[PDB]
Design a binder for this molecule. Structure first.
Ligand code: FMN
Ligand code: SF4
Ligand code: SF4
Ligand code: SF4
Ligand code: FES
Ligand code: FES
Ligand code: K
Lengths: 214, 45, 263, 432
C-alpha cells in the first residue's frame, strides 16, 4: 500500500510535536555549509534523514520543520519524502528488517530467508509486530549481491544467510545484543569461499612501476 | 607487522552509531574552504 | 546576421540561435504534437509526444527542448516520426479511463484530437487500468486525477505564473500523482487558469460542470470589465444563455490568462 | 606482438590491491600500497598531461555506458566563465548484480579520495561531491574517516599535497533510489529535488550541479586515475584488446559455487572467468542455462554463446548484449528463466522515476504482461506484441532506464521464445 496522500490523524498532523535537538542544529549547520550559498535547498535530503534518525519516522510536522529552516516550500519537501524509499512516513519497528528479493538474491534462495522471518516473528511482509520491535518489507538490490541472500536491519548488512542464520540474528536482537554485521558463512567479505584466487601476494610498496618521467 | 593476509582489518564499522556520519561531517567543517556565492539568498529572492 | 539555416522537410528557414526544433516547424506552418510543452511555461520535455526524426540521426529528439543545430533537416512526417507518435499516444491511453461521455473535456480535448490525428485506431492493452483517488483543491477546480497524464503543466504554472508552490508530484513510477499531498486549497487570483492549460479533463471548471459541450457553444469575443486591465475574453453562449467565460489571447494585455472574478 | 589471449592477471598489475579488505584501509595502510605517492608531481604536470595519460590509456567509463573517459573529462578543460566547477563521483551502486563500487569505498577509500583530487585537478574542479547510495551507511562512514585523514595530513583541502591547489571532498548520501545513479538524476538529488533525470542538452559539462559545469564519474573510473598517471597510460593499455583496454572488477554471482568480486583483465573469456575465480557453474559448466553479463540492464545470452564470448565492450556488443558494470549473473537449468527476468522487470517498475511517459506507462505495462507469461496466462500472439512495446519504450525516453528495461525482455524473447510458448500451451490444456 503506502498511499501517497496525507490525511490528518490525531497521531500525525501539522501540530504533532517535533523539533531538532540542540545538538542536531549544529549538525544541520555543518550540512548547509557543504553547498554553495544561495543553494541551501540542496540540504533537504540530509536534513530530512537527520529528522528521521532523531524520530525514527517523518511526521508531517517534521517535514514542515525541514521546510521552515531551509526556506523551502513545504510541497518541495513532501516531494522528497515520498520519492525516496528510505523515508518512513509511518512509524516502523525498532528494527526495520529489509529482505532483498531481486533476481541475484532470488537465485540463491532468498525466499527461504523471507519465509524463516515470517514464521519466526509471526508476521507478514509489510507488518509490524505487536511489540513494535520488527518491521518486515522486501526491497530491491542492496549492493551486497555476491553475498546473497542478505538482509538489511537498520544500518547493517547481514549476508550469506541461511534459514537458520537469520533466525539467530532475530534472537540476538530480541534479547538486546548487537549482532555483528557482515557475512555469516565463514568468509569475511566478497572474497571467494574456497580460498583466495587473487591478491595472495605481498602488495608492492610505494613507487612500484612508476613511469620514468614522473 | 609481518605480512598477514588472513584477518579482516575492516572491523571499525561494527560499532558505528546512528550519528556517526553526521558527526564526521561536523568535524570536516574547519578544513573546508569557503563556498562560492550565487549572489542571492535563493532563487526565490 | 547571426541567423542559422535549418530545413523543415527540405524547406529552408532562417532561425535565431537557441530556437527549438518545435519553434522551427512553426515558422513553416507545421505544429508538432504536444502535451507538456506550453509556450508560456518552462520546458518540461516529459510527455515525449513531440519526438521528431532528424535526418541522418538514428535517435528521435524532443522537439520542444532540442535547440536547432545548423543544417538540420527536420523530418516531421517520416515513418520514424509517425511510429514514435503512435507509441507515445498508446502509452498515454493505456491507463486513461473511458470517461469521454461523462468528461467535461470531451469535444475540446487535446488527448482526443491528437489520438485521432497522430495515434492508432485501437488498443492492444489487455490489462487492468490504474485508478487514482480524487483531490479537493477548492470550490472552483474539480479534480478527477484518473484522467491526469502527468504533464506537469499545472505544477509549472502554479510555481511560475502564479508564484504559488502548492502543487507537485508525490510518489514515483506509475503511481506518480499530482496534487498538494496534504488537504489544501489552491485558491489564487489566477487559479482558474489551470483548467485551460490542463490538456485532459483532470482539471475542469466546477460551476461549468456538465452544462454544455464545446460544439454547441457560440463564441462572442468581448472585453472583461471586472477590473481596469481590460482582459480579452470569449463569452461562450448556448441558446441565448451565457455558459462560461474563456481567455482570449492578447500579447500586450493579459497573455492568455484571466483572473477568477473574470472567469 | 599484440596479445591474442587475455586474462591470468598478476597481483603486481591489479590496481585494487586491498579489494578483499585483508590489509589496513586507513592512511597508514594505503601509503604502504602506493597510494598518495608523487601526487604533487602529478598535479604540477597540469591538466593536459593528466588528461593525456587517461586519453591514451584507453580507459572507458565503468558505470555502464562505457564512454571514453579521457574524452569526457576533456569537456571541462575550458576557461572559467565565473561559475565554480565540480566533479561528482557516482557511488550510487544500484544496478542489480553490481557490488564493485562497494568494495572500493569500504576497503580502498584513499584510492578514491586521491582519484577525486587527480581527476578534479585535470578538470579544474574546486570540489568533489561523492554521491553514495543511502543504504551504504557503514561504507559512507569509512569514506568520511578517510577524507578526515587526508585533510589532517594536508593531502586535500587548502594547498593540497603542497601543490598550491585548493580542493574539497564532500560526501552526500542518497535516500534510496536506483534512478539516482543516472548522471543527470544524481545531480538533481544533490540539488535537493526529486531524482528525475534531465534532458540533454545542456550537458553537465556546460550546465550541471547548481547550474555549474560538472563531470559525473563512476567510483571505479576515478579510483584508477591516480594509478594510470603514476604507471602511465601505456601500461594500462597493455591489457585487453584495442579500444577495450584496462583491468575490470567482476562481480560473479547467482548460480555459481563461489560468488566473488575479483579483478581481472579486460577481454577475459567468460567461461574462463566463471571457472577460474567463482568455482565454476553450480552442477558443472554443462548445467548452465543463461548468463546476464553486465548486470541486469544487459540482455541475457544463452550457453551456446557464453562458451566463446569475451568480457569486453565490443565482444559483448557483437553478441547482442553489453558489458555494463561487468556484473555476471549466472543461471542454471533449475532456474525459471521467465520468472527470473520477470522479477527484473518488477525491479524497473519500482525504480522508475515516473517523469516521462514511455517508461512511466510502459515499464508497468511490460511488468503486467511478463507476470502472465510466468503463469502462461497469455497467447503466443502477445510475444510479438511485447517486443513492439519494448521497442516503443527504447529510444523514446529521457534516460537510459527505459532502454535498460526493454533490453532484458528482448533477450528473453530472442533466445527463449520456445520456453514462453511452451508455458502457454501448458496453461491452455490445464485450464480446459
Ligand atoms: C538507470 C541508470 C542507473 C545508473 N546507475 C549508475 C551507478 O550506480 N554507478 C555509476 O557509476 N553509473 C551509473 N549509471 C551511468 C551514469 O549515467 C553515467 O553513465 C556514469 O555514472 C558516468 O560515469 P562513467 O564515465 O564512469 O561511465 C546509470 C545510468 C542509468 C540510466
Ligand atoms: S480527458 Fe479527453 S480523452 Fe480523457 S476522458 Fe476526458 S475527453 Fe476523453
Ligand atoms: S492535472 Fe492536468 S495540467 Fe496537471 S499534470 Fe495532470 S494533465 Fe497536466
Ligand atoms: S525513462 Fe523512466 S526513469 Fe528515465 S526519466 Fe523517463 S520516466 Fe524517469
Ligand atoms: S539482488 Fe540482492 S543484493 Fe543485489
Ligand atoms: S511536448 Fe516535448 S516532450 Fe512534451
Ligand atoms: K482541462
Amino acid at each position: 500500500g503506502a498511499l501517497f496522500v496525507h490525511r490528518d490523524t490525531p497521531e500525525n498532523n501539522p501540530e504533532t510535536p517535533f523539533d531538532f535537538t540542540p545538538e542536531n542544529y549544529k549538525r544541520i549547520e555543518a550540512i548547509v555549509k557543504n553547498y554553495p550559498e544561495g543553494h541551501k535547498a540542496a540540504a533537504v535530503l540530509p536534513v530530512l534523514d537527520l529528522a528521521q534518525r532523531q524520530n525514527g519516522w517523518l511526521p508531517i510536522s517534521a517535514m514542515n520543520k525541514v521546510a521552515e529552516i531551509l526556506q523551502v516550500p513545504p510541497m518541495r519537501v513532501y516531494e522528497v519524502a515520498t520519492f525516496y524509499t528510505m523515508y518512513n512516513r509511518k512509524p516502523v519497528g525498532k528494527y526495520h528488517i529489509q529482505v532483498c528479493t531481486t533476481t541475484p538474491c532470488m537465485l540463491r534462495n532468498s525466499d527461504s530467508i523471507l519465509e524463516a522471518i515470517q514464521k519466526k516473528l509471526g508476521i507478514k511482509v509489510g507488518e509490524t509486530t505487536p511489540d513494535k520491535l520488527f518491521t518486515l518489507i522486501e526491497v530491491e538490490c542492496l549492493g551486497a549481491c555476491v553475498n546473497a541472500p542478505m538482509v538489511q536491519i537498520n544500518d547493517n548488512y547481514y549476508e550469506d544467510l541461511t534459514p537458520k542464520d537469520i533466525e539467530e540474528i532475530i534472537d540476538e536482537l530480541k534479547a538486546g545484543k548487537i549482532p555483528k554485521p557482515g557475512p555469516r558463512s565463514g568468509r569475511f567479505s566478497c572474497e571467494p569461499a574456497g580460498g583466495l584466487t587473487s591478491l595472495t601476494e605481498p602488495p608492492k610498496g610505494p613507487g612500484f612501476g612508476v613511469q620514468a618521467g614522473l | 607487522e609481518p605480512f598477514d593476509n588472513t584477518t579482516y582489518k575492516n572491523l571499525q564499522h561494527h560499532d558505528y552509531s546512528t550519528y556517526t556520519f553526521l558527526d564526521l561531517n561536523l568535524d570536516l567543517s574547519k578544513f573546508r574552504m569557503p563556498q562560492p556565492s550565487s549572489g542571492r539568498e535563493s532563487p526565490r529572492h | 546576421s547571426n541567423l542559422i539555416e535549418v530545413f523543415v522537410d527540405g524547406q529552408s528557414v532562417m532561425v535565431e540561435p537557441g530556437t527549438t526544433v518545435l519553434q522551427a516547424c512553426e515558422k513553416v506552418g507545421m505544429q508538432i504534437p504536444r502535451f507538456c510543452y506550453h509556450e508560456r511555461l518552462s520546458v518540461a520535455g516529459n510527455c515525449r509526444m513531440c519526438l521528431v526524426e532528424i535526418e541522418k540521426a538514428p535517435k528521435v529528439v524532443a522537439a520542444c527542448a532540442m535547440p536547432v543545430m545548423k543544417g538540420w533537416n527536420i523530418l516531421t512526417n517520416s515513418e520514424k516520426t509517425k511510429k514514435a507518435r503512435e507509441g507515445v499516444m498508446e502509452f498515454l491511453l493505456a491507463n486513461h479511463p473511458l470517461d469521454c461521455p461523462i468528461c467535461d473535456q470531451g469535444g475540446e480535448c487535446d488527448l482526443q484530437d491528437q489520438s485521432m490525428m497522430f495515434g492508432s485506431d485501437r488498443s492492444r492493452f489487455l490489462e487492468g487500468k490504474r485508478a487514482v483517488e480524487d483531490k479537493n483543491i477548492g470550490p472552483l477546480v474539480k479534480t478527477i486525477m484518473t484522467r491526469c497524464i502527468q504533464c506537469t503543466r499545472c505544477i509549472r504554472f502554479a510555481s511560475e505564473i502564479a508564484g504559488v508552490d502548492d502543487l507537485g508530484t508525490t510518489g514515483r513510477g506509475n503511481d506518480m500523482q499530482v496534487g498538494t499531498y496534504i488537504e489544501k486549497m489552491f485558491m489564487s487570483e489566477l487559479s482558474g487558469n489551470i483548467i485551460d492549460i490542463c490538456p485532459v479533463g483532470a482539471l475542469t471548471s466546477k460551476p461549468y460542470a456538465f452544462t454544455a459541450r464545446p460544439w454547441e457553444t457560440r463564441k462572442t469575443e468581448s472585453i472583461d470589465v471586472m477590473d481596469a486591465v481590460g482582459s480579452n475574453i470569449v463569452v461562450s453562449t448556448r441558446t441565448g444563455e451565457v455558459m462560461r467565460i474563456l481567455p482570449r489571447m492578447h500579447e500586450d494585455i493579459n497573455e492568455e490568462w484571466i483572473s477568477d472574478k473574470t472567469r | 606482438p599484440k596479445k591474442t589471449s587475455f586474462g591470468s592477471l598478476k597481483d603486481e598489475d591489479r590496481i585494487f590491491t586491498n579489494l578483499y579488505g585483508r590489509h589496513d584501509w586507513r592512511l597508514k595502510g594505503a601509503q604502504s600500497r602506493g597510494d598518495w605517492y608523487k601526487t604533487k608531481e602529478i598535479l604540477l604536470k597540469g591538466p593536459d598531461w593528466i588528461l593525456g595519460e587517461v586519453k591514451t590509456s584507453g580507459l572507458r567509463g565503468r558505470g555502464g555506458a562505457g564512454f571514453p573517459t579521457g574524452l569526457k573529462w576533456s569537456f571541462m578543460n575550458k576557461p572559467s566563465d565565473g561559475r565554480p566547477k565540480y566533479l561528482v563521483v557516482n557511488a550510487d551502486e544500484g544496478e542489480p548484480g553490481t557490488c564493485k563500487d562497494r568494495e572500493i569505498i569500504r576497503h580502498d577509500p584513499h584510492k578514491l579520495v586521491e582519484g577525486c583530487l587527480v581527476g578534479g585537478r585535470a578538470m579544474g574542479a574546486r570540489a568533489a561531491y561523492i554521491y553514495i547510495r543511502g543504504e551504504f551507511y557503514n561504507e559512507a562512514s569509512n569514506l568520511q574517516v578517510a577524507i578526515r585523514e587526508a585533510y589532517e595530513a594536508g593531502l586535500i583541502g587548502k594547498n593540497a599535497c603542497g601543490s598550491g591547489y585548493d580542493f574539497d571532498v564532500f560526501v552526500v548520501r542518497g535516500a534510496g533510489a536506483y534512478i539516482c545513479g543516472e548522471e543527470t538524476a544524481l545531480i538533481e538529488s544533490i540539488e535537493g529535488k526529486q531524482g528525475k533525470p534531465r534532458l540533454k542538452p545542456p550537458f553537465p559539462a556546460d550546465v550541471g550541479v547548481f547550474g555549474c559545469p560538472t563531470t559525473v564519474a563512476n567510483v571505479e573510473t576515478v579510483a584508477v586515475s591516480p594509478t594510470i598517471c603514476r604507471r602511465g597510460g601505456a601500461w594500462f593499455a597493455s591489457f585487453g584488446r584495442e579500444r577495450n583496454s584496462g583491468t575490470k572488477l567482476f562481480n560473479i554471482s547467482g548460480h555459481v559455487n563461489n560468488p566473488c568480486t575479483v579483478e581481472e583483465e579486460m577481454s577475459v573469456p567468460l567461461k574462463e572467468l566463471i571457472e577460474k575465480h567463482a568455482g565454476g557453474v553450480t552442477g558443472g559448466w554443462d548445467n548452465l542455462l543463461a548468463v546476464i553479463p553486465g548486470g541486469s540492464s544487459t540482455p541475457l545470452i544463452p550457453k551456446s554463446v557464453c562458451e566463446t564470448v569475451l568480457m569486453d565492450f565490443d565482444a559483448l556488443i557483437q553478441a547482442q548484449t553489453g558489458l555494463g558494470t561487468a556484473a555476471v549473473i549466472v543461471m542454471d537449468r533449475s532456474t525459471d528463466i521467465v520468472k527470473a527476468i520477470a522479477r527484473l522487470i518488477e525491479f524497473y517498475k519500482h525504480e522508475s522515476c515516473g517523469q516521462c511517459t514511455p517508461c512511466r506507462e510502459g515499464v508497468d505495462w511490460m511488468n503486467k504482461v511478463m507476470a502472465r507469461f510466468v503463469r502462461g496466462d497469455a497467447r503466443p500472439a502477445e510475444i510479438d506484441s511485447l517486443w513492439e512495446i519494448s521497442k516503443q519504450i527504447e529510444g523514446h525516453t529521457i534516460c537510459a532506464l527505459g532502454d535498460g528495461a526493454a533490453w532484458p525482455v528482448q533477450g528473453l524473447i530472442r533466445h527463449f521464445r520456445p520456453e514462453l510458448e511452451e508455458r502457454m500451451q501448458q496453461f491452455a490444456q490445464q485450464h480446459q
